């Protein structure tokens, strides 16, 4: 078995908080209630003065992705260990299928690479980077048989991943047909391409060139465009890594307007800003380069946190895609060659608690919502995860909201040799992490093996996502006016 009894703490779910013990057996929470009995042999974790919360679910990772030709240094093994140490018990990673390549083969390739290495549970989104009868069939197979209800499309990366409006329309339509959610990288790829070419010709080769060639308008525009196409075919839409105030306002307006869309800010865009691209030290500046870029407006992260609190934005990931200082350096003479991506998987939970809860922007319950419950709802395994209740998976974190910890590349568990949150003092510390009913992290120490985590197979037509979509198919059909010829 391994039986665990978490005693003395306060359970925090999305809807409310209450004092209770949590009894874990065989991978599951089998009971929640006051003063539970300790069965002989069960380990007691003492949660007196702690919050007992669902482990974090990182909706957005790229572990060991080969990109910009090189591969991210946090791999499935180290990345998941780092997640665990930061209070995160599941990651959802993106299968980056290449143009013309089979989606199934790319899927197979990701499972073979991750299955023997994950230390926590995980699941996969699949990128749709080209279109054809074959892609259409493979998307159906993926949604019905391979446990994947999320497909990722790119409006940027011209020549590489980009799809045009007419292909987005076709792809979005077929997502709706197989009951998947459509995820979008929302930047105008034509403007990025022209922007970068122009920055280079002006001799602006540094990281400030990366942000200047694709300011937030270029994100906001594609965000609106994606919502418009999706709304036209009644397909549910998910906007990954919202980085800017204007793009977040597009999503906030579309939702007030009843559009079925979700916005996902990330740790990076909630915890720091793009003024770093202007840093005198090239290496420092290049640490922050990712697409879309962090924004030079200092009010951005606080504004994004306010919208996250208010549910204009709904859940969080990290877009963790790390490259060491010596890999970033591939672009020392040309910012278009800096491999894009920052850290976050480990620090997301503390970063959000410090910037969101300690600051008085959201309460502990909205915190649980935006770090696990909503991910589980949208990707279709709630309340299996994202909730502390009988029958749920025992992915649980004992959380100390009153103590602080400073984030540093010197004490973090990620492979990358720097940290975009370097120096930040955060209230909220994961003191014990439980994953699949086992104590994988306690007293600063990890105790877990590569392969201990499991792939989570999901069904299509997530209810949280589809109930309005289906009712609209029923009563929102356009009608003819009846006329003599």
* 156-195 positions binding a copy of itself, by CB under 8 A: 164-166, 169, 188, 190-191, 193-195
Grouping H, G, I as helix, E, B as strand and the rest as coil, residue 430 is strand
Grouping H, G, I as helix, E, B as strand and the rest as coil, residue 59 is strand
- The stretch among 40-48, 67-75, 212-220, 288-296 that binds a copy of itself (CB under 8 A) is 212-220
Question: Facing residues of 314 across strands?
Answer: none
Q: Choose from Zn ion, a copy of itself, none: what does 164 bind? Cβ within 5-8 Å by kind.
A: a copy of itself
Complex with a copy of itself: residue 26 or 258, whichever CB lies closer: 258
Closest separation in Å from C-beta 399 to a copy of itself:
15
- The radius of gyration of the chain's CA atoms, rounded to the nearest angstrom, is 22
Closest separation in Å from C-beta 320 to Zn ion:
9
DSSP letter assigned to residue 155:
S
Q: Choose from a copy of itself, Zn ion, none: what does 197 bind? Cβ within 5-8 Å by kind.
A: none
Closest separation in Å from C-beta 227 to a copy of itself:
8
Q: How many residues does the chain have?
A: 485
Q: Please report whether residue 16 would count as binding a copy of itself according to CB under 8 A.
A: yes
CA distance 124 to 147: 8
Q: Please report whether residue 358 would count as binding a copy of itself according to CB under 8 A.
A: yes
Task: Let me know if 73 is exposed, middle or buried by CB neighbors in 10 A (0-12, 13-18, 19+).
Answer: buried
Residue list 49-88, contact with a copy of itself (CB under 8 A): none
- The stretch among 4-12, 139-147, 180-188, 349-357 that binds Zn ion (CB under 5 A) is 180-188
Residues 198-237: x where in contact with Zn ion by CB under 5 A, - otherwise, as a string: ----------------------------------------
82 CB neighbour count, 10 Å cutoff: 26
Grouping H, G, I as helix, E, B as strand and the rest as coil, residue 108 is helix
**The only residue of 363, 417, 422, 442 in contact with a copy of itself, by rule CB under 8 A:** 363
CA distance 167 to 336: 26
CA distance 446 to 392: 23
Nearest to 368 by CA among 392, 387, 344: 387
Closest separation in Å from C-beta 306 to a copy of itself:
5
Nearest to 366 by CA among 296, 433, 316, 420: 316
Binding-site size, a copy of itself (CB under 8 A): 84
CA distance 44 to 154: 47
Q: Please report whether residue 299 would count as binding a copy of itself according to CB under 8 A.
A: yes
Closest separation in Å from C-beta 107 to a copy of itself:
28
Cis before 383 (ω within 30): yes
Complex with Zn ion: residue 14 or 319, whichever CB lies closer: 319
Q: Please report whether residue 319 would count as binding Zn ion according to CB under 5 A.
A: yes
Closest separation in Å from C-beta 210 to a copy of itself:
12
Closest separation in Å from C-beta 165 to a copy of itself:
4
* Beta carbons of 403 and 429 less than 8 angstroms apart: yes
Complex with a copy of itself: residue 345 or 370, whichever CB lies closer: 370
Residues 133-172: x where in contact with Zn ion by CB under 5 A, - otherwise, as a string: ----------------------------------------
CA distance 94 to 113: 13
Please report, as ranges, the residues that interact with Zn ion according to CB under 5 A: 185, 319
């Amino acid at each position: 078995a391994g039986e665990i009894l978490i005693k003395g703490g306060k359970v925090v779910n999305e809807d409310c908080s209450f004092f209770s013990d949590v009894h874990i057996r065989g991978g599951k929470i089998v009971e929640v209630g006051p003063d539970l009995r300790v069965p002989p042999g069960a380990r007691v974790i003492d949660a007196t003065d702690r919050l007992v919360i669902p482990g974090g679910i990182d909706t957005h990772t790229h572990m060991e992705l080969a990109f910009m030709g090189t591969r991210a240094v946090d791999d499935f093994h180290i990345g998941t260990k780092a997640a665990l140490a930061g209070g995160t018990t599941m990651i959802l990673d993106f299968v980056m299928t290449q143009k013309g390549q089979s989606l199934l083969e790319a899927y197979d390739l990701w499972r073979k690479t991750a299955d023997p290495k994950v230390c926590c549970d995980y699941s996969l989104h699949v990128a749709v980077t080209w279109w054809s009868d074959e892609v259409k069939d493979e998307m159906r197979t993926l949604a019905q048989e391979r446990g994947v209800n999320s497909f990722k499309m790119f409006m940027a990366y011209k020549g590489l991943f980009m799809l045009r409006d007419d292909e987005l329309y076709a792809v979005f339509s077929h997502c709706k047909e197989v009951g998947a959610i459509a995820q979008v990288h929302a930047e105008n790829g034509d403007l990025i391409a022209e922007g970068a070419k122009k920055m280079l010709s002006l001799g602006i080769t540094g990281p400030e060139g990366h942000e200047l060639c694709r300011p937030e308008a270029v994100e906001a525009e594609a965000t609106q465009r994606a919502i418009t196409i999706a709304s036209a075919v009644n397909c549910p839409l998910y906007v990954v890594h919202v980085m800017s105030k204007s793009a977040a306002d597009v999503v906030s307006k579309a939702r007030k307007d009843g559009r079925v869309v979700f916005g996902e800010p990330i740790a990076a865009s909630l915890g720091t800003d793009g003024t770093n691209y202007w840093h005198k030290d090239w290496a420092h500046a290049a640490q922050y380069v990712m697409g879309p870029p962090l924004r030079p407006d200092p009010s951005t992260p606080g504004y994004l946190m306010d919208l996250l609190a208010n549910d204009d934005l709904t859940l969080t990931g990290t877009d963790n895609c790390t490259f060491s200082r010596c890999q970033k350096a591939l672009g020392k003479d040309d910012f278009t060659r800096i491999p894009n991506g920052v850290n976050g998987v480990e620090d997301r939970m503390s970063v959000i608690w410090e910037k969101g809860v300690h600051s008085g922007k959201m309460d502990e319950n909205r915190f649980v919502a935006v770090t696990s419950s909503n991910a589980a709802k949208i990707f279709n395994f709630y309340p299996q995860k994202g909730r502390i209740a009988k029958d749920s998976d025992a992915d649980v974190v004992i959380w100390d909201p009153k103590t602080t910890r400073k984030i540093s590349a010197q004490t973090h568990h990620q492979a990358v040799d720097y940290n975009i949150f370097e120096g930040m003092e955060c209230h909220g510390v994961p003191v014990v992490t439980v994953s699949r009913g086992r104590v994988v992290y306690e007293e600063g120490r990890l105790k877990v093996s590569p392969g201990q985590g499991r792939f989570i197979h999901r069904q299509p037509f997530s209810e949280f996502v589809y109930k309005r979509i289906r009712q609209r198919d029923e009563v929102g059909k356009p009608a003819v006016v009846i006329r003599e010829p």
